[PDB]
Structure formats: structure tokens, C-alpha cells
Amino acid sequence: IIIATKNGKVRGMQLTVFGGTVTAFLGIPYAQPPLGRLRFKKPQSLTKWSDIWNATKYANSCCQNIDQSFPGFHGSEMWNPNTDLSEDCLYLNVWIPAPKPKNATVLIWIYGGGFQTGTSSLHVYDGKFLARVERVIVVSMNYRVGALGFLALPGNPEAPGNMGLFDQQLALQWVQKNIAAFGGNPKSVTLFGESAGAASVSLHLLSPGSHSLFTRAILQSGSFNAPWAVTSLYEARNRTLNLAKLTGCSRENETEIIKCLRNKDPQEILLNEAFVVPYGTPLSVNFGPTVDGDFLTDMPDILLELGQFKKTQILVGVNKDEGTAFLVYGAPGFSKDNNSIITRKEFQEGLKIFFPGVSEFGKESILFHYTDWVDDQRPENYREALGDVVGDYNFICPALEFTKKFSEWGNNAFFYYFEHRSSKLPWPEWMGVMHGYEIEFVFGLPLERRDQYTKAEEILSRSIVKRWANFAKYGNPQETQNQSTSWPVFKSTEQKYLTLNTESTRIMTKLRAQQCRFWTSFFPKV
Numbered sequence: 001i002i003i004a005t006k007n008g009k010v011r012g013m014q015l016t017v018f019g020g021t022v023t024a025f026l027g028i029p030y031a032q033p034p035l036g037r038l039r040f041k042k043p044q045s046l047t048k049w050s051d052i053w054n055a056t057k058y059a060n061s062c063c064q065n066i067d068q069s070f071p072g073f074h075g076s077e078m079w080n081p082n083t084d085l086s087e088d089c090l091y092l093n094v095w096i097p098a099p100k101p102k103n104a105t106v107l108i109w110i111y112g113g114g115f116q117t118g119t120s121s122l123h124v125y126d127g128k129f130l131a132r133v134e135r136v137i138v139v140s141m142n143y144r145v146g147a148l149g150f151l152a153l154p155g156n157p158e159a160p161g162n163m164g165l166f167d168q169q170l171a172l173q174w175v176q177k178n179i180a181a182f183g184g185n186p187k188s189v190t191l192f193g194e195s196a197g198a199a200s201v202s203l204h205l206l207s208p209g210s211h212s213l214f215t216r217a218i219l220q221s222g223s224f225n226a227p228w229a230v231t232s233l234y235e236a237r238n239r240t241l242n243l244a245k246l247t248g249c250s251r252e253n254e255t256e257i258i259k260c261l262r263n264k265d266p267q268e269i270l271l272n273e274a275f276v277v278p279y280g281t282p283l284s285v286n287f288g289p290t291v292d293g294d295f296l297t298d299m300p301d302i303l304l305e306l307g308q309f310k311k312t313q314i315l316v317g318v319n320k321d322e323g324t325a326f327l328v329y330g331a332p333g334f335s336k337d338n339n340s341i342i343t344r345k346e347f348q349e350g351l352k353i354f355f356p357g358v359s360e361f362g363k364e365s366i367l368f369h370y371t372d373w374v375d376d377q378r379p380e381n382y383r384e385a386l387g388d389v390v391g392d393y394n395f396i397c398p399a400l401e402f403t404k405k406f407s408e409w410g411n412n413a414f415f416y417y418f419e420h421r422s423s424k425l426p427w428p429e430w431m432g433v434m435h436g437y438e439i440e441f442v443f444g445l446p447l448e449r450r451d452q453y454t455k456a457e458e459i460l461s462r463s464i465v466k467r468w469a470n471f472a473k474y475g476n477p478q479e480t481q482n483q484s485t486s487w488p489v490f491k492s493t494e495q496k497y498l499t500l501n502t503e504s505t506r507i508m509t510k511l512r513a514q515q516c517r518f519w520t521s522f523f524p525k526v
């Protein structure tokens with residue numbers, strides 16, 4: 001019940017799940033807290049301790065702005081942090097099966113949130129189900145987000161960038177040294193994450209410093225080649241002094257600017273984060289990954305194209321309606337409380353919100369490819385198109401392109417297309433299979449029959465959990481026991497993927513081919 005780690009001794013707690021027991025270690029620190037002088041830089045090695053650490057409750061979430069656009073609405077507040085915010089937040093969690101396993105495959109989860117939000121404490125990231133059903137060990141960590149974690153003056157150790165990525169990486173190192181004492185196999189470690197977390201997974205594939213810290217990778221609705229995924233160094237530094245003039249920390253010795261930024265309380269840093277870009281976006285990564293030259297040594301699209309990444313198996317996938325979630329965060333004519341039927345001109349106004357610094361002809365190119373309807377007169381035409389426009393551009397096509405380029409270098413890749421709409425999804429029905437609402441199925445939440453999910457969702461979650469675990473343990477996401485569809489490798493020629501839903505899991509080819517060619521061949525030119 002008490003585990004001796006290579007820097008201290010931690011105590012956990014027992015949980016009863018499905019007539020069994022899971023040992024949970026909540027909130028274990030993996031770094032000296034990045035407070036005071038340590039704010040904005042790479043995490044430092046946590047030094048030894050003497051007590052028995054009582055890791056029996058989620059630790060603090062990292063500082064972050066909160067989605068306040070729907071106060072009291074579970075669809076929005078589900079994602080807001082559910083522990084205290086604090087700069088002292090570099091902690092992790094461990095779920096081990098009871099009784100303690102011997103050489104268990106370890107799953108490391110990295111949450112999403114546009115690199116500005118998110119926390120491991122979330123209800124839909126509970127790894128107790130996974131530990132019980134599949135007797136894998138589940139780990140998740142808190143990493144700094146927003147400017148406190150991704151402010152960048154490139155070169156400057158006082159603020160080099162990618163600190164939150166380096167946070168993640170130090171947690172992977174902690175698993176390498178300590179997960180053996182928990183009965184886990186450091187030689188069988190699968191990273192998985194969602195959206196921004198999924199982009200981080202793909203970045204750990206490029207980053208040499210992480211190659212020795214995991215074996216395989218799963219990417220859910222995200223990859224680094226997504227337009228929101230990596231910030232330039234041009235706009236990065238523009239974004240730091242814009243934050244310095246907003247805080248009155250404009251100096252000219254870049255190190256002395258940082259010292260000024262450290263005696264500002266976290267709330268003032270959070271407040272100015274928004275106004276740092278002139279024309280924001282529902283998907284505006286104001287402070288995100290950069291080519292720091294330390295974690296990310298080159299422009300990631302070049303590393304990808306030229307095969308400069310860890311060779312291993314990936315599992316990639318997207319949801320049917322990735323885009324809809326963002327339409328009600330600014331797009332005109334949209335709301336979560338009506339059918340959101342928009343017209344042609346509400347659509348065109350919606351493009352300017354999602355593509356603000358894009359030419360007039362560029363906006364017209366998007367309109368021409370998505371408003372040549374399979375047929376006119378349907379009232380949802382413009383509503384559905386703009387959802388797809390945001391989905392195809394920001395998630396679906398970059399994930400597909402990432403998978404093709406990765407597979408061309410000879411590794412097994414598996415692609416899925418999640419198209420089940422949760423029967424408990426709070427948002428309306430026109431928003432479809434929303435971005436983020438496969439996570440509960442991955443973590444096995446429909447397995448708790450007390451949780452209001454239908455039987456079919458329990459079956460679908462049960463198979464997904466099996467497929468995910470098999471991929472983690474054996475590199476192949478099959479469900480061999482029940483007479484279920486086999487999941488084929490994604491080859492760059494045939495481009496086979498598997499659909500996931502309650503009815504049928506069918507095998508199809510070349511997902512969103514016409515739409516994705518537009519986004520990946522002729523739109524990057526504008």
C-alpha cells in the first residue's frame with residue numbers, strides 16, 4: 001500500500017471498481033515547483049524527500065483561463081479544471097491494478113486544451129476503469145499551459161519555450177525510473193492524448209530527447225502538422241513583448257524583461273494572454289509549441305517529410321464532427337440553443353472569424369469548394385458546411401496527412417473514424433459527434449452501468465478499450481475474442497480506416513479525400 005520510489009516514499013488509496021480493487025496514487029510531484037525564479041523555464045530535478053508522501057488526492061491544476069461562455073452548462077464546464085489552480089502543479093497520477101501486477105504495459109495520458117487549458121484531474125480522464133478491465137497501469141500528468149508554459153524567447157534559458165512539453169517529458173522520465181516499483185514495464189509504454197495532447201504525442205515522436213521514454217503512440221483528434229499546433233518564432237516573440245508592453249515590462253535586455261514578468265502575479269499574466277493576438281480565433285493557440293532548438297530541433301513538417309522521428313506503431317483517428325464545437329464560440333448565427341440555421345452571408349462572416357489574416361480570394365476558395373452542394377435548397381447547407389470547413393482544416397486533414405507521411409517510412413499505422421454521438425452529450429444534436437466526446441469511451445466510462453449510458457455504448461466502449469489496450473501491449477489494436485471486424489494497417493496507397501460506432505464497424509478507404517486535397521495541396525498556397 002506504500003511504494004518506495006527513487007526519490008521518496010508515496011502512499012496511495014484503494015478503490016472498488018466492478019467488484020475489484022484498483023490502487024490509485026493521485027498527485028505525485030515530478031519536479032521542483034516552477035515558482036519564483038523558476039517561473040517560465042524548464043522543469044528542474046525534484047530533490048529527495050524524507051516523509052511518506054500522501055498521494056491520495058488530485059493535486060493543483062496549472063494556472064489557466066477558464067471557459068466562462070456557458071456558466072452552469074455541463075457541456076462547457078466538464079472541461080474546466082476541478083482542482084485549485086496554482087503555479088505549483090507539476091504532479092502526476094498512477095493507477096495500478098490490484099493485486100499489484102508484475103510486468104504491466106503502462107499507458108501515459110496527455111490532456112488537450114489548445115495548449116492553454118486542461119488538467120489531468122478531469123472526470124473523463126479517470127484511469128481506474130482501464131486499470132481494472134485491462135490491468136494496464138495508467139499515468140497522467142499536469143503540464144504548464146498558456147504563457148506560463150510556452151512563452152518563448154528562443155535561445156534564452158530564462159524563457160526558451162516548450163516548457164510544458166519539457167514538463168511532459170520529465171514525467172515520462174519519472175515513469176522510466178519509478179514505474180517498475182509499481183509493477184509496470186518501462187519497456188512497454190504507450191503515450192496517448194487528445195487534440196492538443198495528441199499534437200504533443202506526435203511532437204514527442206519528433207523530439208530526440210523523448211525517443212527513449214516510450215514505445216508506441218496514440219493520437220486522438222490531433223497532430224503537430226495542424227495549423228494551430230506549432231507557433232512560429234516570428235509571431236512567438238511578437239506575442240511575448242505584446243505581453244510585456246501590456247504588463248509594462250517592456251525593456252530591451254530580454255533577460256531583464258523576464259525578471260519583470262516574474263514579479264507579476266499569475267492572474268495578470270492570464271488576463272493579458274487573450275489580447276496578445278490582434279484578431280483571435282476560437283482555436284487560437286496564443287502560447288504554444290515552438291521550434292526552440294532544444295525539444296524541437298527543426299520545423300516539424302520538415303522532420304515529418306524527411307522521416308526524422310521515432311519508428312514505431314501509431315494509432316491515429318478523428319471524430320465525424322470535429323468542427324461544430326467551435327462554431328458557438330464566436331461564429332455569427334450559431335448557438336447551442338437553436339438549430340443554428342445560417343445563411344450564405346452568415347457563412348462568409350464565419351470564414352473571416354476562422355481565417356482572419358487570409359486573403360479575400362482565400363476565403364472565396366473555401367466557399368467555392370464547400371458551397372457547391374450535393375444539392376441546394378436544404379436549410380442546413382451553410383451550417384453543416386462551416387462545421388466541416390473547421391473540422392477538415394483543423395483536425396481531420398492534418399491527422400490523415402500525418403498518418404500517410406508517417407506510414408510511408410514503413411511503420412504500422414492504424415486510423416479510425418469515430419462516428420458515435422454520446423447519448424449523454426449535453427450539447428444539441430446538430431453539433432453531431434463533437435470534438436472531444438470519444439474520450440469517455442476510451443477511458444471506459446460507459447462500462448459503469450450506473451452511469452446512464454446505453455447497452456450499445458457499453459459494448460462499443462468495451463471493444464475500444466480492448467483495441468486500445470491491445471495496441472499498447474502488442475502493437476496491434478485488434479479484438480480477437482469476439483467475432484469483430486479486424487482493423488487493417490493504414491498504407492499510403494490504399495488508405496484503409498475503421499469506423500467506430502454502435503451499429504457496425506465498417507472498413508472504408510480514403511477518408512475525406514476531395515476535401516483534404518483542397519486543404520493540403522491548394523489551400524497552403526494562399
Ligand SMILES: Cc1nccn1Cc1cn(CC[C@H](NC(=O)/C=N/O)c2ccccc2)nn1
Pocket residue numbers: 065066067068079111112113114115116117118194195228282283284285325326329435436437
Ligand atoms: C480539452 C478538450 N478536448 C475537447 C474539447 N476540449 C476543450 C475545448 C475548448 N474549446 C474552445 C475554447 C478555448 N479552448 C481551447 O482549448 C482551444 N483549442 O484550440 C478557450 C481558451 C481560453 C479560455 C477558455 C477557453 N474547444 N474545446
Ligand SMILES: *[C@@H]1O[C@H](CO[C@@H]2O[C@@H](C)[C@@H](O)[C@@H](O)[C@@H]2O)[C@@H](O)[C@H](O)[C@H]1NC(C)=O
Pocket residue numbers: 054
Ligand atoms: C498521511 O496519512 C496517514 C494515514 O492516513 C490515515 O490512515 C489511512 C489508512 C486512511 O484511512 C486515511 O484516510 C487516513 O487519513 C496519516 O496518519 C498521516 O498523518 C498523513 N500525513 C500527512 C502529512 O498528511
Ligand SMILES: *[C@@H]1O[C@H](CO[C@@H]2O[C@@H](C)[C@@H](O)[C@@H](O)[C@@H]2O)[C@@H](O)[C@H](O)[C@H]1NC(C)=O
Pocket residue numbers: 238239242243245246275276277278279
Ligand atoms: C505584433 O504586435 C503588434 C502590436 O499589436 C497591438 O498591440 C498589442 C499590445 C495588442 O493590444 C494587439 O491586440 C494590438 O493589435 C501588431 O500591430 C502586429 O500586427 C503584430 N505582428 C507583427 C508581425 O508585427
Ligand SMILES: *[C@@H]1O[C@H](CO)[C@@H](O)[C@H](O)[C@H]1NC(C)=O
Pocket residue numbers: 102103185187
Ligand atoms: C519485463 O519485460 C521486459 C521485456 O524485454 C524484460 O526485459 C524484463 O526483464 C521484464 N521484467 C520483469 C520484472 O518481468
Ligand SMILES: *[C@@H]1O[C@H](CO)[C@@H](O)[C@H](O)[C@H]1NC(C)=O
Pocket residue numbers: 253254255256
Ligand atoms: C542583460 O542583462 C543580464 C543581467 O543583467 C546580463 O547578464 C546580460 O549580459 C545583459 N545583456 C546585454 C546584451 O546587455
Ligand SMILES: *[C@@H]1O[C@H](CO)[C@@H](O)[C@H](O)[C@H]1NC(C)=O
Pocket residue numbers: 459462463466479481482
Ligand atoms: C465479448 O462478448 C461477450 C458476450 O458474448 C461480452 O460479455 C464481452 O464483454 C465481450 N468482450 C469484448 C472485449 O467486447
